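Re: the multi-chain job from yesterday

Posting the exact lines I submitted so nobody has to dig through the queue logs.
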Amino acid sequence: ALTLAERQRLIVEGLPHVSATLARRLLKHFGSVERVFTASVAELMKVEGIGEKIAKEIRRVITAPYIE
Amino acid sequence: ALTLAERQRLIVEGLPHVSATLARRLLKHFGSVERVFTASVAELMKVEGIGEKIAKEIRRVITAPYIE
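And the result, structure tokens for all chains:
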């Protein structure tokens, strides 16, 4: 079954523009799934591979209302 | 390309013991991925379908430090 680390990576990989490599980088940078998902645009931009465009697309998915 | 809603569900479905059905319930209740990911165990339990066991498991995965 999924190890904790694998599950953490798969959750973060659900973000747009985020590959396995960027997911690992994000998790190592911020330290937990919660911290990756609460990081501001400016904080995300400090991560290699993430510019203003990607940072905002990531924040959009995280902060957008869920509409069915 | 995944739609915003599909991605939101995908991310939440990455949580332990959370099916597509429960993912939708969580998103409809909290409104956004960020709110689901910052909800305390007690808050997660307000969702019908989320018991103590599941809530604790969800929170553990979300807040656990990332280590390989």
